[PDB]
Design an enzyme around this catalytic site. Structure first.
Site, PDB file in Angstrom:
ATOM      1  N   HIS A   1      46.271  42.016 109.018  1.00  0.00           N
ATOM      2  CA  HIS A   1      46.875  41.003 109.930  1.00  0.00           C
ATOM      3  C   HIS A   1      48.031  40.235 109.273  1.00  0.00           C
ATOM      4  CE1 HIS A   1      43.547  38.288 108.342  1.00  0.00           C
ATOM      5  NE2 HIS A   1      44.568  37.406 108.369  1.00  0.00           N
TER       6      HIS A   1
ATOM      7  N   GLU B   1      40.812  46.641 108.058  1.00  0.00           N
ATOM      8  CA  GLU B   1      41.517  45.349 107.817  1.00  0.00           C
ATOM      9  C   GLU B   1      42.090  45.285 106.402  1.00  0.00           C
ATOM     10  OE1 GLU B   1      42.416  43.708 110.290  1.00  0.00           O
ATOM     11  OE2 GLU B   1      43.357  42.010 109.260  1.00  0.00           O
TER      12      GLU B   1
ATOM     13  N   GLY C   1      43.889  29.827 105.657  1.00  0.00           N
ATOM     14  CA  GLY C   1      44.513  29.732 104.322  1.00  0.00           C
ATOM     15  C   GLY C   1      43.749  30.484 103.237  1.00  0.00           C
TER      16      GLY C   1
ATOM     17  N   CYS D   1      42.624  33.680 103.651  1.00  0.00           N
ATOM     18  CA  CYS D   1      42.726  35.133 103.917  1.00  0.00           C
ATOM     19  C   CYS D   1      43.427  35.776 102.724  1.00  0.00           C
ATOM     20  CB  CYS D   1      43.353  35.452 105.270  1.00  0.00           C
ATOM     21  SG  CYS D   1      42.179  35.119 106.620  1.00  0.00           S
TER      22      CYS D   1
END
Ligand SMILES: O=C(Nc1ccccc1)N1CCCC1
Length: 182
Positions: free
Chosen positions: A41, A72, A146, A148
């Site tokens: 992402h 992911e 914040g 990730c």
């Protein structure tokens, strides 16, 4: 404060950079040579900022499992003048549960941040922001925007990268040795 934080600190000081894309600032784990990982992402393009330096992306791959399900994890090769310390021997070979993990973050917003998250469940399937995702680890800590890209470790193992939360739990994508065979 203890051997958990000691291992975590050793990984943060030598194997992380601050990556900035149009979607924000992320902790980025360097794995070997010029190869690093970042949550998919982050939407890595042709140019990324690495520690505020303009850097060409030589290659990038959004990983999916053999069911064609999102994992992911994006693997990025950076046009950087320096190699990472090779940490592939710290990556697990198989999907597993863990005791006593640390989530470590280093950004402008959260510098030198180490969270003891405790027990890590092999959760498996998660609908992550509407996207079916596999190989998810879960820990019972209220992680926040914040974090990730944050690195999840146990003593002796680098086991995942933080990719989401629901306000009560945090979720990480597994790292497996087989992702980084060259
Ligand atoms: O942002 C935090 N704590 C925090 C909590 C969970 C995840 C990440 C950070 N703080 C602001 C001042 C008190 C502590």
């Amino acid at each position: 404060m203890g051997p958990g934080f000691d291992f975590a600190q050793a990984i943060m000081k030598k194997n992380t950079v601050i990556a900035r894309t149009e979607k924000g600032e992320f902790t980025m784990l360097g794995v070997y040579d010029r190869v690093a990982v970042i949550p998919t992402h982050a939407s890595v393009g042709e140019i990324i900022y690495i520690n505020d330096v303009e850097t060409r992306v030589l290659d990038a791959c959004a990983l999916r499992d053999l069911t064609d399900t999102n994992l992911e994890i994006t693997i990025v090769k950076l046009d950087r003048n320096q190699k990472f310390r090779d940490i592939r021997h710290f990556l697990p070979r198989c999907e597993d549960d863990y005791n006593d993990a640390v989530l470590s973050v280093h950004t402008s917003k959260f510098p030198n941040m180490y969270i003891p998250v405790g027990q890590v469940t092999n959760y498996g399937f998660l609908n992550l922001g509407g996207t079916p995702t596999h190989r998810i680890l879960m820990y019972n800590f209220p992680t926040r925007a914040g974090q990730c890209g944050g690195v999840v470790t146990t003593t002796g193992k680098v086991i995942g990268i933080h990719v989401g939360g629901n306000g009560a739990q945090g979720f990480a994508a597994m790292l497996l040795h087989s992702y980084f065979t060259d």
